[PDB]
């Protein structure tokens, strides 16, 4: 029975390099080609590399070209993937799969990959911006507003409205890991279209890692 | 009966006084040819042959190694070490060699017209020796061999395994000349047509395609062989430029070579051949092509060169 | 080049589910299907179009034709819910590429059509020399969509950072996407558009720098 294990994953600050290994067993390793695949947290699979059984040929995705170098070793039944310059977006789970044959063939068996995390480990306070209502943002008798927390590290932030006095219709989204290496979050609440110019709405944000709290009043636009 | 691994004795038709190399070595390593080796035939009997599991291939390989090391002396060898050696220019000329079995044993020979290399064979015969075989250390193309009597035959321990190489024996012999190289384009095109016939008969009618090999050492990417003791390397891109459903090939001579004898690189000295095409070694590119299927030249393994000759023979023990 | 397959496939138990996969390279190249369950490594299901690797459930059929390969699942069950991927190669056969991923899920509540709201850059942000359009998607079920940004009528992919569909308080799903731009780019184009594809429907919301 086939078995593929991966190793080398961990946490590394950007700019560093790395080497991932993949031991195989249960099939003629010397007669098969191997693929490296990548999958960011909760994202679709992304192909990384392929290498032939004899190693004469091997190809990389245009994304990691020039940084990743794929290797192998049949005398040890081991596959290798070296990453010279680590980018934030390189953070993902790295699966090591075998090929149907030994020359540019489908990905048959997958071995549970290894998680690679790239993070600058550098604190930074958020920058809140206002998301005010407009014509289209109004869905009939109701409209929607919010605030946008931007470029903060390391998560998570809390966000309330009117110091937690507003809880109906409010909804917060998950954060993204922008290419810059930091996190951006967006919070929103829906309110009656009438109260836009009568009641005040203040977005409260708490980033405890930096010991910062940001209050940002959301005002409608002049038009 | 069951075949047994023994030390056959090669029977050559060589001459001692003559300067040539294979003759010098075969004089002291082989024996003269029997005027006739009685071909004791059997009709109502069959036996299992597996060309990919025959000790005769191994023994032959070791004999050719002993010939090259004993005879053709490379200038220098790099096999994880260093060595300085003389480089006498030798006369390299493959001669027909037989491989006879000693007393108590015999050689079962499959005399069936078409034989896919593996599986039982009918119309089996018994012999004491082997037909005329020339140890040709060629790649990509098989030369000075024994072509299939009727039509064409393709062989491989597993066609659906693209790593496993494919051996081919032709309907006719194709003339190839070298000194650069030349070769009748038309006869080549015809042989290609026949190969397409067999292959198409093998892979559910899928369209067949030819194309040169990609990557590899200069030995594998190019047709490498010997000529008067000098290593020839030729570019066979002109023989693979069409897809189905005269030619002159450029060549070089660089003595820096990768010894087929062992995983290492040995060199010779600068310097100071017309043959047949009796077989072909190919590899299939699996890929994902819906209808197209591409086959490219390859080799590098000499046991495949011997197996093209010792596929019907196999040792056996008797009273 | 690209393999486009639906984002979500809702299924009431027992019905026959079907997933597609369109790519101009499928004309001369096979399609290979794949399955990945929650927190598990993906697994092959169908290779070279029709062919199946026994013994896997025969209810998985592959109909490769033209530029469309269809993965059919007879009698979907609660176990079958998972993320499927059609993968292939480009015209050259040298590179491999995966589809966007299709989320097969059993219907536990009624299908909710996504509501989309696109917020253009704020004045303070611009005065900080930065711009970001914020597309927000809410109240959709099942929880899987695609997000395609466009400048004028042209697709844009540089600067797009999207989340994965999370769960609201009301048991429905909500996702967000961000398009990061410089003020110049925001002042040059006539209008940017966030596009959201949820099964059966694609909604698009446009903003312009001229508007407020
Ligand atoms: C020429 O070369 C080709 C290949 O290059 C070759 O084709 C392959 O031949 C080999 C064997 O020689 C095949 O490998 C074997 O396949 C066996 C079957 O595998 C399938 O079934 C597995 C489980 O089935 C059970 O459950 C079902 C119930 O539905 C039942 O019917 C079955 O009877 C059985 O009880 C399944 O696990 C397996 O899936 C795994 O393996 C494949 C491999 O690619 C992989 O894709 C999957 O991701 C997954 O890992 C598959 O669906 C298999 O049983 C056999 O197992 C070996 O190990 C066990 C140890 O317990 C031994 O008991 C067993 O005897 C074997 O040693 C082995 O894996 C291979 O599938 C062929 N591939 C093809 C045809 O495409 C040709 O034969 C060669 N032709 C020649 C020489 O002429
Ligand atoms: C497959 O078998 C072929 C036939 O043996 C191989 O081709 C032959 O290889 C030998 C090298 O050992 C060549 O020998 C050379 O011949 C030339 C020319 O001969 C001259 O001398 C004679 C005198 O009788 C004269 O009649 C001729 O007109 C020539 O003037 C010599 O100059 C060399 O010194 C050397 O003896 C054969 O010539 C050659 N056969 C040919 C060209 O027909 C072939 O190499 C084998 N394939 C392999 C190894 O891959
Ligand atoms: C070579 O010939 C043998 C004959 O046994 C092949 O083995 C079987 O041949 C029969 C044809 O009657 C097929 O139905 C079987 O499927 C074959 N068995 C297997 C496992 O394939 C053998 O396949 C042939 N080998 C090659 C390379 O063609
Ligand atoms: C390659 O070499 C062979 C001879 O080894 C050539 O065969 C000759 O063909 C012509 C026909 O026009 C005959 O008249 C000759 O007698 C043949 N030669 C011999 C020795 O018999 C063949 O023509 C050569 N082909 C090329 C392209 O050079
Ligand atoms: C066995 O050999 C004889 C020839 O001696 C032949 O006539 C016969 O057809 C063969 N097969 C039999 C008897 O089944
Ligand atoms: C004997 O011969 C068979 C096949 O010819 C081979 O598989 C086996 O390895 C050989 N054994 C030895 C000791 O040479
Ligand atoms: C067996 O092979 C020989 C060739 O060596 C042939 O003469 C004979 O006719 C064959 N016997 C058959 C086909 O029955
Ligand atoms: C090539 O084949 C012909 C007959 O097919 C034969 O007469 C000739 O001797 C062969 N040439 C060599 C060098 O063996
Ligand atoms: C091989 O040559 C013979 C001529 O006797 C011919 O009958 C046969 O068809 C040829 N093989 C092919 C075309 O595959
Ligand atoms: C053989 O000829 C082709 C022509 O394009 C060339 O690409 C290839 O590099 C040549 N191989 C050599 C010189 O080994």
Q: Do domains A1-120 and A121-217 have the same CATH topology?
A: yes
Contacts of A27 in chain B (CB under 8 A): none
Distance in angstroms (rounded) separating the CA atoms of residues B120 and B124: 10
Cβ proximity of B155 and B255 under 8 Å:
no
DSSP string, chain C: ---B--SEEEE-TTS-EEE--B-GGGGTB--EEEEE-TTS--EEEE-STT---SSS-TTEEEEEETTEEEEEESS--GGG-EEEEEEEE-TTSS-EEE---EEEEE-SS--BPPEEEEEPPPHHHHHTT-EEEEEEEEEEBSS--EEEEEETTEEE-TTEEE---EE-TTS-EEEEEEEEE-HHHHHHSS-EEEEEEETTEEEEEEE-SS--
Cβ proximity of A39 and A46 under 8 Å:
yes
CB spacing of B215 vs A105 below 8 angstroms: no
Cβ proximity of A6 and A113 under 8 Å:
yes
CB spacing of C98 vs A131 below 8 angstroms: no
DSSP string, A65-86: TTTEEEEEETTTTEEEEEESS-
Residues with Cβ within 8 Å of A155's Cβ and at least 6 positions away in sequence, in order, are: A175, A183
Distance in angstroms (rounded) separating the CA atoms of residues A125 and C38: 34
Q: Is the peptide bond before B179 cis (omega within 30 degrees of 0)?
A: no
Cβ proximity of B223 and B234 under 8 Å:
yes
Residues comprising chain C, all counted: 212
User: Tokens 């184009």 label which residue?
Assistant: C189
Q: Which two tokens stand for residue B253?
A: 């001579």
CB spacing of C29 vs B289 below 8 angstroms: yes
C136 contact A CB<8A: yes
Q: Which residues of A198-214 are buried (b: 16+ CB within 10 A; e: fewer)?
A: eeebebbbebeeeeeeb
B289 contact C CB<8A: yes
CATH of the domain at B286: 2.170.40.20
Q: Which residues pair with B49 in a beta bridge?
A: B119
CB spacing of C132 vs A139 below 8 angstroms: no
Q: State the fold for domain A121-217.
A: Immunoglobulin-like (2.60.40)
- Interface test mutation site (partner A, options C6, C49, C113, C119, max chain A beta carbons within 10 A): C119
Distance in angstroms (rounded) separating the CA atoms of residues A50 and A58: 5
Nearest CB to B286; choose among A31, A56, A105: A105
Nearest-CA residue of chain C relative to B285? C93
Chain C: partners with 3+ C-beta pairs within 8 Å: A, B
Q: Which two tokens stand for residue C188?
A: 């040059």
Ligand nearest, relative to CA of residue B147: 8
Distance in angstroms (rounded) separating the CA atoms of residues B16 and B29: 11
Cβ proximity of A104 and C94 under 8 Å:
yes
Closest-CA residue to A110 (of A101, A99, A97, A100):
A97
Q: How far is C110 from chain A (nearest CA, A)?
A: 20
Ligand nearest, relative to CA of residue B136: 2
Q: What's phi and psi for B23, nearest 5 deg?
A: -70, -45
Cβ proximity of B194 and B154 under 8 Å:
no
Ligand nearest, relative to CA of residue B51: 6
Helices and strands (H and E) in chain A: how many: 0, 19
Return the SS3 of B23: helix
Closest-CA residue to A42 (of C22, C171, C143):
C143
Structural domain count, chain B: 1
Return the SS3 of A90: helix
CB spacing of C87 vs A46 below 8 angstroms: no
What is the architecture of the domain spanning A1-120?
Sandwich (2.60)
Q: How far is B81 from chain A (nearest CA, A)?
A: 21
C92 contact B CB<8A: no
Q: How far is A171 from chain C (nearest CA, A)?
A: 7
Closest-CA residue to A4 (of A108, A71, A69, A98):
A98
Contacts of B290 in chain C (CB under 8 A): 27-30
Q: What's phi and psi for B62, nearest 5 deg?
A: -60, -35
Q: What's phi and psi for B132, nearest 5 deg?
A: -70, 110
Enumerate domains of chain C plus CATH numbers: 1-108 (2.60.40.10), 109-212 (2.60.40.10)
User: What are A196-202's contacts with CB under 8 Å, separation 24+?
Assistant: A196/A133, A196/A143, A196/A220, A200/A162, A201/A145, A201/A161, A201/A162, A201/A166, A202/A161, A202/A162, A202/A163
**Atom 7 in ligand 9: residue holding the nearest Cα:** B151
> Which stretch of DSSP H or E encloses residue A16?
none
Cβ proximity of B127 and B268 under 8 Å:
no
Q: Which two tokens stand for residue A191?
A: 């309110």
CA distances from C153 to A113, C149, C179, C192 (A): 39, 10, 15, 8
A102 contact B CB<8A: yes
Closest-CA residue to A169 (of A144, A193, A199, A147):
A144
Distance in angstroms (rounded) separating the CA atoms of residues C87 and C31: 6
Q: Which residues of B72-84 are buried (b: 16+ CB within 10 A; e: fewer)?
A: bebbbbeeeeeee
CB spacing of A57 vs B162 below 8 angstroms: no
C50 contact B CB<8A: no
Distance in angstroms (rounded) separating the CA atoms of residues B255 and B242: 32
Ligand 3 touching residue B120 (CB < 6 A): no
The angle subtended at Cα C147 by Cα C142 and Cα C152, nearest 5°, is 145
**Atom 9 in ligand 6: residue holding the nearest Cα:** B55
Domain boundaries, chain A: 1-120, 121-217
Domain range for residue B121? 1-319
Nearest CB to A110; choose among C41, C96, C115: C41
Nearest-CA residue of chain C relative to B289? C29
CA distances from C192 to A45, B120, B161, C176, C200 (A): 28, 72, 52, 16, 23
Compute the distance from residue B134 Cα to the ligand 8 centre, in Å: 12
Cβ proximity of A136 and A167 under 8 Å:
no
């Amino acid at each position: 029975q086939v078995q593929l294990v991966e190793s080398g994953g961990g946490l590394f600050q950007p700019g560093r390099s790395l080497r991932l290994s993949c031991v195989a067993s249960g099939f003629s390793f010397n007669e098969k080609a191997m693929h490296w695949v990548r999958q960011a947290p909760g994202k679709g699979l992304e192909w990384v590399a392929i290498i032939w059984y004899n190693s004469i040929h091997k190809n990389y995705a245009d994304s990691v070209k020039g940084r990743f170098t794929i290797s192998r070793d049949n005398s040890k039944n081991t596959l290798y993937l070296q990453m010279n310059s680590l980018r934030a977006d390189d953070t993902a789970v790295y699966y090591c799969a075998n090929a149907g044959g030994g020359k540019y063939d489908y990905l048959d068996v997958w071995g549970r990959g290894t998680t690679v995390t790239v993070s600058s480990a550098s604190t930074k306070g958020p920058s809140v911006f206002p998301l005010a209502p407009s014509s289209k943002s109004t869905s009939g008798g109701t409209a929607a507003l919010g605030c946008l927390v931007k470029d903060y590290f390391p998560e998570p932030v809390t966000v309330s409205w009117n110091s937690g006095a507003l809880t109906s219709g409010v909804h917060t989204f998950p954060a993204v890991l922008q290419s810059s290496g930091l996190y951006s979050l967006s919070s929103v609440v829906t309110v009656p279209s009438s109260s836009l110019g009568t009641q005040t709405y203040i977005c409260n944000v708490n980033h405890k890692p930096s010991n910062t709290k940001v209050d940002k009043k959301v005002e409608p636009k002049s038009c | 009966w069951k075949e047994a691994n023994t030390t056959l004795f090669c029977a050559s038709d060589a001459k001692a006084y003559d300067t040539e190399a294979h003759n010098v070595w075969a004089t002291h390593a082989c024996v003269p040819t029997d005027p006739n080796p009685q071909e004791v035939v059997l009709e109502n009997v069959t036996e299992n042959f597996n060309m990919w599991k025959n000790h005769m291939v191994e023994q032959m390989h070791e004999d050719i190694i002993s010939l090259w090391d004993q005879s053709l002396k490379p200038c220098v060898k790099l096999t994880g070490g260093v060595i300085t050696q003389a480089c006498p220019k030798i006369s390299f000329e493959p001669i027909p060699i037989h491989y006879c079995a000693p007393a108590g044993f015999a050689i079962l020979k499959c005399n069936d017209k078409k034989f896919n290399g593996t599986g039982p064979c009918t119309n089996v015969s018994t012999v004491q020796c082997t037909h005329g075989i020339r140890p040709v250390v060629s790649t990509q193309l098989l030369l000075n061999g024994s072509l299939a009597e009727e039509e064409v035959v393709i062989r491989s321990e597993n066609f659906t395994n693209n790593v496993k190489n494919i051996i081919v024996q032709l309907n006719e012999s194709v003339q190839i000349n070298c000194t650069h190289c030349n070769i009748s384009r038309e006869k080549w095109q015809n042989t290609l047509k026949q190969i397409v016939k067999k292959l198409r008969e093998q892979f559910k009618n899928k369209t067949i395609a030819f194309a040169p090999s990609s990557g590899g050492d200069p030995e594998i990417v190019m047709h490498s062989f010997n000529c008067n003791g000098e290593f020839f390397y030729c570019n066979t891109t002109k023989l693979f430029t069409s897809t189905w459903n005269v030619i002159t090939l450029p060549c070089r001579i660089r003595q820096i070579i990768n010894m087929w004898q062992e995983v290492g690189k040995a060199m010779y000295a600068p310097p100071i051949c017309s043959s047949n095409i009796t077989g072909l070694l190919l590899t299939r590119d699996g890929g994902v092509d819906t209808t197209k299927e591409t086959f490219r030249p390859g080799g590098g393994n000499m046991k495949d060169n011997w197996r093209s000759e010792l596929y019907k023979y196999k040792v056996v023990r008797i009273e | 080049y690209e393999l486009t397959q639906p984002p979500s496939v809702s299924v009431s138990p027992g019905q026959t589910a079907r997933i597609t996969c369109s790519g101009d390279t499928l004309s001369t190249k096979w399609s290979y299907w794949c399955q990945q369950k929650s927190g598990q490594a993906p697994v092959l299901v169908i290779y070279e179009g029709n062919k199946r690797f026994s013994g896997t459930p025969a209810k998985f059929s592959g109909f490769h034709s033209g530029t469309m390969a269809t993965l059919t699942i007879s009698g979907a069950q609660v176990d079958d819910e998972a993320d499927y991927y059609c993968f292939s190669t480009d015209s050259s056969g040298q590179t491999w590429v995966f589809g966007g991923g299709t989320k097969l899920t059993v219907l536990r509540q009624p299908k909710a059509a996504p509501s989309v709201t696109l917020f253009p850059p704020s004045s303070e942000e611009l005065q900080a020399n930065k711009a970001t359009l914020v597309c927000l998607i809410s109240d959709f079920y099942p929880g899987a969509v695609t997000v395609a940004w466009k400048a004028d009528s042209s697709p844009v992919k540089a600067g797009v950072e999207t989340t994965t569909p999370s769960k609201q308080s009301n048991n429905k799903y909500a996702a967000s996407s961000y398009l990061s731009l410089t003020p110049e780019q925001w002042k040059s184009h006539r209008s940017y558009s966030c596009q959201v594809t949820h099964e059966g429907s694609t909604v698009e919301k446009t903003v312009a720098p001229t508007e407020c």
